[PDB]
Design a protein around this ligand. Structure first.
Ligand SMILES: CCCCCCCCCCCCCCCCCC(=O)OC[C@H](COP(=O)([O-])OCC(O)COP(=O)([O-])OC[C@@H](COC(=O)CCCCCCCCCCCCCCCCC)OC(=O)CCCCCCCCCCCCCCCCC)OC(=O)CCCCCCCCCCCCCCCCC
Ligand SMILES: CCCCCCCCCCCCCCCCCC(=O)OC[C@H](COP(=O)([O-])OCC[N+](C)(C)C)OC(=O)CCCCCCCCCCCCCCCCC
Ligand SMILES: CCCCCCCCCCCCCCCCCC(=O)OC[C@H](COP(=O)([O-])OCC[N+](C)(C)C)OC(=O)CCCCCCCCCCCCCCCCC
Ligand SMILES: CCCCCCCCCCCCCCCCCC(=O)OC[C@H](COP(=O)([O-])OCC[N+](C)(C)C)OC(=O)CCCCCCCCCCCCCCCCC
Ligand SMILES: CCCCCCCCCCCCCCCCCC(=O)OC[C@H](COP(=O)(O)OCCN)OC(=O)CCCCCCCCCCCCCCCCC
Ligand SMILES: CCCCCCCCCCCCCCCCCC(=O)OC[C@H](COP(=O)(O)OCCN)OC(=O)CCCCCCCCCCCCCCCCC
Ligand SMILES: CCCCCCCCCCCCCCCCCC(=O)OC[C@H](COP(=O)(O)OCCN)OC(=O)CCCCCCCCCCCCCCCCC
Ligand SMILES: CCCCCCCCCCCCCCCCCC(=O)OC[C@H](COP(=O)(O)OCCN)OC(=O)CCCCCCCCCCCCCCCCC
Ligand SMILES: CCCCCCCCCCCCCCCCCC(=O)OC[C@H](COP(=O)(O)OCCN)OC(=O)CCCCCCCCCCCCCCCCC
Ligand SMILES: CCCCCCCCCCCC(=O)OC[C@H](COP(=O)(O)OCC[N+](C)(C)C)OC(=O)CCCCCCCCCCC
Ligand SMILES: C[C@H](CCC(=O)O)[C@H]1CC[C@H]2[C@@H]3[C@H](O)C[C@@H]4C[C@H](O)CC[C@]4(C)[C@H]3C[C@H](O)[C@]12C
Ligand SMILES: *C(=O)CCCCCCCCCCCCC
Ligand SMILES: [Zn+2]
Lengths: 156, 55, 127, 128, 171, 122, 459, 174, 12
């Protein structure tokens, strides 16, 4: 039974509208920040911090414990992406930039070394192994009719 | 490995403070591959789905 | 920092209700009230037969239950499988293909009696 | 002296390291007073119906309705064709289709040429 | 809103827990645990709201640089490998109202003893509603804390789900 | 290994190339060189079903060991003597490969000295 | 086909002339007898189709679609009982009359030997379908959904009418058997480029093709459950069945005219699969899931290989049962919470243990877990498209990953986590609801034993 | 007996005679005796009883035989009645040729398993026959498309024949 | 001690 005035609407132009808009979404009129009016269809839906639900207090008594939400709280435009089963934005022990540099450096270094170790293989001091009957020409599917090129190995 | 680990294992009892090292955190956090790829790939894919694919 | 004067009363009021609720969750000795049930004559026999320890006669039940299991879970399936393979699968071409047995120099073939000539004399050396 | 924490969109600034958690003025303290005032009013309405023993059903949540409504039905009436929406529409709408057309058209033109010449190995290719 | 004392106490608890994770061995932790206490006891009397604040901010920045990358967590605490584990066994109480009569018949005492709580809950509801609407200011409640019962025979307002909440190891 | 340092941290023309050996005529330096003999015929190996990498000069010992194993079943600790004989026979085959390798290394260095001698005078 | 046409028509007298309280029982029982007799259509010969008369015929392509159509009618009657339980008796019988008349048109559509007869019945399914959506839909948007459903189909159908009549004048007949022998190749000219588009765009919009699908999220969401089951299970397959017929008379022009539609389909399924990862409406998520599976069918029909035509037939029948089941599962929740939001009721596995088993099986077949016929059809198309171009394996594989992500996301949001505290009316699943899910999944899982009856004429 | 040995050839079997070199009891032999007694014997009795009942009620089914009819080459243009019979025969022969490729493939796969590690040499006969039939199958029924037919097969043949005719002529020009 | 375990109805 939600009426047209209780639903999201167009961008607030006059200062009075932002007051009505903020009251509609249960926010302080000084805390209500509509999205930029660039024509991407956000209207007057509040813009909330891009913080994952995993950050919210795990000990507070939530109406919806798994979603970390309170009945009537304005939900983030991307709530379904910030649920606890998805993207997590919690602070990390190591700075984000230093994480990428270390991981990229490790992978980049390892790949180069494998290439370095590819052109310089490590093998043992032995010549090619020898097999009889012309290097197993008949065993390896050689044509019975066309007699093979003779191959001879000598005792040593 | 046993000798190096056993002696290094024996040094935990000494009353000496710790020095947070990059190598230590690198091993502890699995090289950051989860902390990045499990926050970057889901974010990009799940943001293109809503902004571009749907809206 | 501690509880305000009213908070200590509320928790006590609830803590008494909560501890009373957890007592109601206990089941009476008769519960659960199971509707009347009938067992097979075989089941009744072992209920009283096995009361005495009698290690010599206790293994009988162990072999009894394992003997039944082998008959209903090993012997019957292998009968069905062997009957299925012998008279329905193996009667069709190439359904079961065996890697031919290896013949070594010195063996005797059971189909014709042929004896594969042994290998020539080796340059024997003890090492 | 330590490396000041650097925050990206996926690594939020810790509250402890946030300067906004220490410089507490009268407005900041009062600002939280009104936040908990509205948060308390909503927590009241929910519990009146949540705990009511004569209620069987679903407590309609207008916040939930407004969330889904904006995500689906209020988008187009708030859409304006401009430079941003037009360029993004073509780049993400038509770009991939043109890209994949030349990847596949080029590949099939290449392969079709070999088969006519006879240079493509199709010795045992009888399933298609 | 948190007071300076509240924030200071929390930093002391976290540092020991991370320091405890760093040391592992108890005696080594005991040695360093006291030294950490000493660094806190030397600023207890500081009555300068500005110099004291600078200490906390510098104290937190030191904690972050030295926090354990993988701090110990109690299994059922948020992040430990038992959190929400048994939430899959916690059934709401109202499900029993849907049981078949032949299924309630298995527990005549429990369900006979259950109507009392339902009888008790309905009777108390009207008083609980009246108590709240008379102690609520004109503009509505300003906090989530709830008043207790101010008489005898009256249960605290909004007790049903707090009292009847599922156990912690239901199955 | 150790010989890698003489090919990677050193001259490569003075070292054998396992992808190119042998680089000299087999009879060069061997008057009426003898040829290795295979005791086991092709049919015996074919009927014995030996893996191609085992269809080598060292065969006719593996066949005997395999024949023993089929016969000593379930005594799987037996036939140990035939294992050592085949292990030894393969070992002799491995050393000869090293001899071919050391022979290759010496011949390459021999070509080095010969070329330098006639090169320096010129 | 009169042994199925006439019995279907007799379901209308049965409904109107039966007691007031027996309209559901009698219609369900007799519509199941009709479905039982449709198994006689499996008298298929390896060289020739089963040609009954001058009007109707049934080959291995029509037979699986006919059995699916006649099998759904009783399932549609079981689903509709709850939300029609409190409606005027005459209007309950008008609703049932619409479903029967929709089955009457469908079975004649899948068996018509003459394409203009196919067009009339293909185009006649709109009237009963539109009436179901707009009259017995629940929301205000049902009125806007019918218009989108109406003018998208007609905008493509009317050009098809001109092309079909044009072909008859040139060829002398629209009989399918005649076209199999009198077909001539299509020369590469601008005139034939628009003949090709006319013959296909009608069938593309019904699949639907990515780009022309905006009517499907509206019609499949605002319709009642009975409407959503037929819309997604059969009516989407009139496009697939149409293309499988009309491409006979469009070679070799299909070699190059299929590029824009293959790119829209190959790329479209990634786009629509990704949309399912962020849908706030459970029913809408299932609707967008249809566009991805039907994108494989469009690619399967446009490459014209025996492995592609066998995959397409299996994919259509497989998706027919799976899509219908998913809508029913989502509807069982709606009949309790009366809302289509996905994140409103959670942890339902705690309150409805058996209904969560159906959710698991519905999701497993949706993501094509082998050896289900869902996987068989999808697997065959992937092999056929790989031979068309090896690079397509990237797009096919990426869609399998995304397909499994949203399938399990739907299963984890509603059937796992913590139950919503304030929803206290999740009554135990009725026998009607449980039997509805069994009648979907059980025949779906049985076809794995003998899948050759859903592999079409090229088996 | 059950199946024709000419279509599915199998080389003669050769089983080495046991030559034990141990005094221990070979368990397999004892299990073999037990299996032939507690499994093989009871199964045969049931099969023998079932077989006798079959002989009491004996009846036959026949392999359908199609008399050849004029093929597409002899059918006039746009003559459905002749084209219909020619096309149905082509579709029937298409199915038979598909199963012929299966028979050859079955022989090829059977050879690989039977010959063990010597398959790459002892199965050169099967591989060569497999390569020949597949190429014959490919030349006739490949690249026709989902809407294949006798007309499309004939046109592909005429294209192949023309290239062969021109290729021989062009080479003979030199 | 035996405690009553609350479950959803399993009869249906
Ligand atoms: C082996 C596969 C077994 C799979 C299985 O049984 O899962 C059931 C199982 C049931 O789920 P559940 O959670 O355990 O059940 C709990 C219920 O809440 C409550 O369950 P419950 O314990 O209270 O009651 C027992 C049972 C109740 O079942 C019944 O009593 C009735 C069952 C009737 C089914 C058959 C009727 C149809 C036959 C009609 C024709 C008859 C002709 C007669 C002549 O419950 C059910 O199973 C529900 C019915 C599900 C039917 C669907 C499966 C049958 C499809 C055929 O499903 C799963 O565990 C999830 C799937 C896991 C396996 C997926 C991966 C499988 C990979 C492929 C398998 C191999 C394929 C073939 C290989 C080919 C190479 C050889
Ligand atoms: C061409 C290759 C295929 C491309 C498609 C696959 C690439 C990945 C794009 C899809 C990722 C997003 C899927 C939808 C969201 C579901 C997953 C999710 O939400 O993330 C939560 C999870 C987070 O789980 P978590 O284990 O990292 O931590 C969860 C939080 N705790 C531990 C506290 C409980 O992230 C993932 O598992 C998905 C990331 C892996 C995929 C990216 C790596 C791709 C391989 C690169 C080599
Ligand atoms: C698990 C155990 C599996 C093995 C069981 C052993 C028996 C077995 O599998 O073989 C018997 C057979 C497979 O065995 P078979 O085909 O190899 O041969 C057995 C019999 N002989 C040898 C004589 C030929 O199984 C089936 O064929 C089952 C077919 C299921 C058909 C289901 C459709 C009927 C319902 C129609 C209404 C619904 C419409 C759905 C939509 C439209 C679909 C077209
Ligand atoms: C939108 C554009 C509508 C007009 C079609 C373009 C006309 C044109 O460029 O034709 C010449 C070009 C020149 O190539 P063409 O020589 O192959 O012309 C088409 C073939 N004939 C003439 C025999 C019919 O044709 C095209 O390929 C244009 C491709 C149009 C499709 C692009 C949009 C697809 C969505
Ligand atoms: C056998 C070998 C196999 C090897 C397999 C493993 C290979 C691993 C390769 C190494 C991977 C290292 C990761 C490097 C990518 C790091 C991306 C990155 O750091 O940028 C992400 C970007 C952060 O910047 P931003 O969030 O915009 O700043 C704050 C603004 N409020 O945040 C954003 O997401 C903005 C958009 C940019 C997205 C990144 C580009 C894609
Ligand atoms: C082809 C892509 C064309 C993109 C270039 C044209 C867009 C552009 O440059 O902007 C022009 C104009 C905005 O100009 P401006 O004055 O700043 O704002 C209008 C205020 N009345 O733009 C406008 O005002 C009107 C918008 C005209 C462009 C709309 C059509 C462009 C394509 C939209 C995306 C199509 C997506 C198709 C999807 C395919 C399947 C996924
Ligand atoms: C959004 C944009 C929508 C508007 C797009 C308009 C595209 C249609 C352009 C006009 C129709 C094309 C045309 O003029 O066809 C003429 C041609 C007549 O040639 P004809 O007389 O048949 O010569 C051989 C006679 N023996 O026709 C023929 O040769 C016969 C071909 C059959 C006629 C096909 C129907 C016309 C095309 C329908 C519209 C385009 C395809 C469907 C679009 C769906 C949207
Ligand atoms: C959102 C709307 C969704 C509905 C979309 C409507 C359907 C798409 C519009 C119809 C387009 C059909 C093609 C129109 C006539 C094309 C002209 C033509 O005849 O192409 C001939 C050319 C043949 O060249 P070739 O194969 O190399 O040589 C053998 C030829 N005997 O063959 C070719 O050149 C190949 C075809 C050329 C076109 C390639 C461009 C593909 C672009 C990606 C698809 C984008 C679809 C439009 C998106 C709008 C937004
Ligand atoms: C979810 C958001 C939307 C995502 C959109 C999809 C991703 C877009 C990625 C950017 C586009 C990349 C494609 C570029 C065109 C293909 C060029 C190419 O490199 O093809 C490689 C290979 C060539 O095969 P061929 O068809 O014969 O072409 C030969 C032409 N000289 O082609 C093949 O034969 C097929 C090889 C398939 C390889 C497996 C699939 C790759 C992904 C594997 C998982 C990730 C691991 C990557 C490392 C393994 C790579 C094989
Ligand atoms: C010319 C047909 C003459 C029919 C005369 C008549 O009066 O037909 C009337 C009867 C109807 O009988 P009923 O079952 O009571 O119908 C209504 C029963 N309700 C009210 C329970 C739904 O029609 C027949 O029997 C079938 C004729 C077609
Ligand atoms: C053999 C095993 C262990 C008995 C024991 O040694 O204690 C017992 C434990 C449970 C038994 C099974 C279960 O009771 C279920 C079946 C019940 C009947 O005993 C027939 C076979 C049946 C399948 C049993 C076979 C066997 O006797 C079992 C498997
Ligand atoms: C050479 O072919 C293998 C590469 C070397 C790996 C082994 C390294 C250890 C041997 C060097 C130390 C020698 C003293 C023990
Ligand atoms: Zn309802």
């Amino acid at each position: 039974h939600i009426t047209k005035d209780m639903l999201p609407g167009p961008y607030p132009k006059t200062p009075e509208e932002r007051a009505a808009a903020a009251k509609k979404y249960n926010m302080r009129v000084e805390d209500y920040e509509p999205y930029p009016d660039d024509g991407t269809g956000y209207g007057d839906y509040p813009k909330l911090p891009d913080r994952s639900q995993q950050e919210r207090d795990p000990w507070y008594d939530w109406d919806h414990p798994d979603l970390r939400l309170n009945w009537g709280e304005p939900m983030h435009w991307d709530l379904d992406m910030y649920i606890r089963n998805r993207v997590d934005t919690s602070p990390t022990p190591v700075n984000w930039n230093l994480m990428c540099k270390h991981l990229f450096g490790f992978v980049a270094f390892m790949l180069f070394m494998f290439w370095v170790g590819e052109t310089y293989p490590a093998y043992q001091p032995v010549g090619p192994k020898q097999y009889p009957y012309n290097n197993l020409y008949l065993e390896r599917g050689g044509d019975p009719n066309k007699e093979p090129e003779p191959v001879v190995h000598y005792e040593i | 490995g046993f000798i190096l680990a056993l002696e290094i294992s024996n040094m935990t009892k000494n009353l000496k403070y710790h020095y947070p090292s990059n190598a230590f955190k690198f091993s502890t956090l699995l090289g950051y591959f989860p902390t990045i790829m499990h926050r970057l790939a889901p974010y990009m894919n799940l943001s293109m789905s809503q902004k571009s694919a749907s809206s | 920092s501690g509880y305000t004067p009213e908070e200590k009363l509320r928790l006590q009021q609830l803590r008494e209700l909560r501890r009373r609720w957890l007592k109601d969750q206990e089941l009476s000795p008769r519960e659960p009230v199971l509707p009347p049930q009938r067992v097979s004559p075989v089941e009744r026999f072992w209920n009283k037969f096995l009361q005495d320890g009698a290690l010599w006669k206790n293994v009988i039940y162990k072999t009894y239950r394992h003997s039944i299991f082998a008959f209903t879970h090993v012997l019957i399936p292998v009968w069905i499988i062997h009957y299925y393979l012998k008279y329905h699968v193996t009667t069709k071409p190439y359904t079961i293909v065996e890697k031919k047995p290896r013949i070594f120099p010195g063996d005797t073939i059971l189909e014709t009696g042929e004896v594969i000539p042994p290998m020539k004399e080796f340059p024997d050396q003890h090492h | 002296s330590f490396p000041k924490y650097e925050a990206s969109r996926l690594s939020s600034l810790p509250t402890t390291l946030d300067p906004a958690e220490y410089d507490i003025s009268s407005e900041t303290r009062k600002a939280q007073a009104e936040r908990l005032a509205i948060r308390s009013r909503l927590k009241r309405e929910y519990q009146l119906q949540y705990y009511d023993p004569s209620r069987r059903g679903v407590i309609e949540d207008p916040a939930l309705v407004r969330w889904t409504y904006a995500r689906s039905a209020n988008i187009y009436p708030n859409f304006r064709p401009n430079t941003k929406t037009s360029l993004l529409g073509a780049l993400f709408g038509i770009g991939p289709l043109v890209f994949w057309y030349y990847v596949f058209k080029t590949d099939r033109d290449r392969k079709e040429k070999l088969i006519q010449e006879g240079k493509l190995d199709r010795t045992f290719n009888i399933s298609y | 809103y948190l007071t300076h004392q509240q924030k200071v106490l929390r930093l002391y608890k976290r540092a020991l827990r991370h320091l405890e994770s760093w040391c592992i061995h108890r005696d080594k932790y005991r040695y360093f645990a006291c030294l950490l206490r000493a660094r806190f006891d030397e600023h207890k009397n500081e009555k300068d709201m500005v110099k004291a604040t600078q200490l906390l901010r510098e104290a937190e920045e030191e904690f972050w640089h030295g926090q354990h990358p993988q701090p110990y967590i109690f299994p059922e605490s948020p992040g430990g490998t038992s959190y929400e584990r048994y939430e899959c066994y916690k059934v709401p109480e109202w499900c029993l109202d849907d049981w078949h009569p032949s299924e309630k018949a298995m527990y005549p005492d429990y369900f006979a003893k259950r109507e009392q709580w339902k009888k008790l809950r309905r009777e108390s509801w009207e008083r609980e509603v009246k108590q709240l609407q008379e102690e609520t200011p004109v503009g509505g409640p300003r906090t989530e804390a709830l008043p207790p019962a101010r008489k005898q025979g009256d249960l605290p307002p909004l007790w049903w789900h707090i009292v009847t909440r599922p156990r912690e190891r239901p199955m | 290994g150790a010989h890698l340092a003489r090919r990677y941290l050193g001259d490569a023309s003075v070292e054998p190339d396992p992808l190119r050996m042998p680089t000299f005529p087999p009879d060069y330096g061997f008057p009426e060189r003898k040829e290795r003999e295979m005791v086991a015929t092709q049919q015996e190996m074919n009927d014995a079903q030996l893996v191609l990498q085992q269809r080598d000069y060292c065969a006719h010992y593996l066949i005997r060991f395999l024949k023993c194993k089929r016969d000593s079943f379930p005594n799987f600790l037996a036939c140990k003597h035939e294992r050592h004989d085949w292990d030894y026979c393969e070992h002799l085959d491995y050393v000869k490969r090293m001899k071919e390798f050391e022979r290759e290394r010496r011949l390459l260095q021999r070509k080095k000295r010969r070329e330098q001698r006639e090169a320096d005078m010129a | 086909m009169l042994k199925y046409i006439i019995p279907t028509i007799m379901l209308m007298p049965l409904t109107w002339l039966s007691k007031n309280n027996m309209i559901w029982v009698n219609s369900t029982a007799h519509s199941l007898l009709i479905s039982f007799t449709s198994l006689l259509l499996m008298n298929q010969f390896g060289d020739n189709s089963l040609n009954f008369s001058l009007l109707f015929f049934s080959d291995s392509l029509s037979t699986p679609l006919l059995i699916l159509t006649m099998w759904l009618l009783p399932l549609m009657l079981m689903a509709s009982q709850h939300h029609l339980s409190k409606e005027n008796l005459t209007r309950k019988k008008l609703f049932i009359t619409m479903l029967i008349s929709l089955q009457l048109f469908l079975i004649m559509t899948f068996t018509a030997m003459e394409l203009i007869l196919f067009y009339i019945l293909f185009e006649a399914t709109l009237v009963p379908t539109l009436i179901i959506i707009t009259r017995w839909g629940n929301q205000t948007e049902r009125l806007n959904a019918g218009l989108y459903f109406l003018f998208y189909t007609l905008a493509g159908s009317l050009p098809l009418l001109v092309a079909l009549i044009y072909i008859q004048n040139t060829v002398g007949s629209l009989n399918f058997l005649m076209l199999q022998y009198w077909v001539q190749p299509v020369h590469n000219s601008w005139s034939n480029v628009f003949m090709w588009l006319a013959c296909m765009m009608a069938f593309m919009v019904k699949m639907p093709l990515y780009g022309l699908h905006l009517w499907l999220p509206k019609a499949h969401v605002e319709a009642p459950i009975a409407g959503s089951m037929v819309l997604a299970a059969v009516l989407l397959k009139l496009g697939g069945y149409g293309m499988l017929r009309i491409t006979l008379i469009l070679n070799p022009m299909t070699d190059f005219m299929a590029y824009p539609f293959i790119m829209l389909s190959l790329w479209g399924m990634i786009m629509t699969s990704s949309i399912c990862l962020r849908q706030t409406d459970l029913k809408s998520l299932i609707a967008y899931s249809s566009v991805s599976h039907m994108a494989l069918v469009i690619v399967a029909i446009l490459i014209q290989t025996p492995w592609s035509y066998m995959g397409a037939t299996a994919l259509m029948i497989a998706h027919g049962l799976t899509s219908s089941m998913l809508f029913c599962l989502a509807n069982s929740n709606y009949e309790r919470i009366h809302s289509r939001t996905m994140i409103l009721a959670r942890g339902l596995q705690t309150l409805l243990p058996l209904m969560a088993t159906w959710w698991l099986l519905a999701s497993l077949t949706n993501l094509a877990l082998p050896p289900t016929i869902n996987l068989i059809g999808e697997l065959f198309v992937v092999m056929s498209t790989f031979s068309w171009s090896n690079i397509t394996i990237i797009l096919m594989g990426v869609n399998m990953v995304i397909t499994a992500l949203y399938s399990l996301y739907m299963l984890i949001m509603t059937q796992r986590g913590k139950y919503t505290y304030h929803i206290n009316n999740i009554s135990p699943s009725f026998t009607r609801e449980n039997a509805l899910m069994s009648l979907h999944i059980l025949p779906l899982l049985l076809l794995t034993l003998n899948p050759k009856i859903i592999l079409g004429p090229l088996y | 007996d059950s199946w024709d040995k000419d279509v599915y050839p199998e080389p003669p079997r050769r089983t080495p005679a046991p030559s034990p070199q141990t005094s221990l009891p070979n368990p397999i032999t004892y299990l073999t005796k037990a299996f032939d007694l507690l499994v093989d014997r009871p199964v045969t009795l049931v099969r023998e009883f079932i077989e006798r009942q079959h002989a009491k009620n004996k009846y036959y089914y026949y392999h359908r035989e199609f008399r050849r009819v004029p093929d597409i080459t002899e059918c006039q243009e746009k003559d459905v009645l002749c084209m219909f019979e020619a096309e149905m025969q082509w579709r029937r022969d298409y199915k038979v040729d598909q199963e012929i490729v299966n028979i050859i493939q079955e022989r090829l796969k059977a050879c690989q398993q039977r010959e063990g590690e010597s398959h790459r040499q002892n199965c050169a006969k099967e591989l060569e026959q497999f390569t020949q039939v597949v190429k014959a199958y490919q030349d006739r029924y490949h690249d026709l498309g989902a809407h294949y037919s006798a007309r499309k097969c004939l046109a592909k043949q005429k294209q192949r024949m023309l290239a062969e005719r021109k290729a021989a002529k062009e080479a003979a020009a030199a | 001690k035996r405690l009553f375990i609350i479950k959803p109805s399993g009869f249906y």
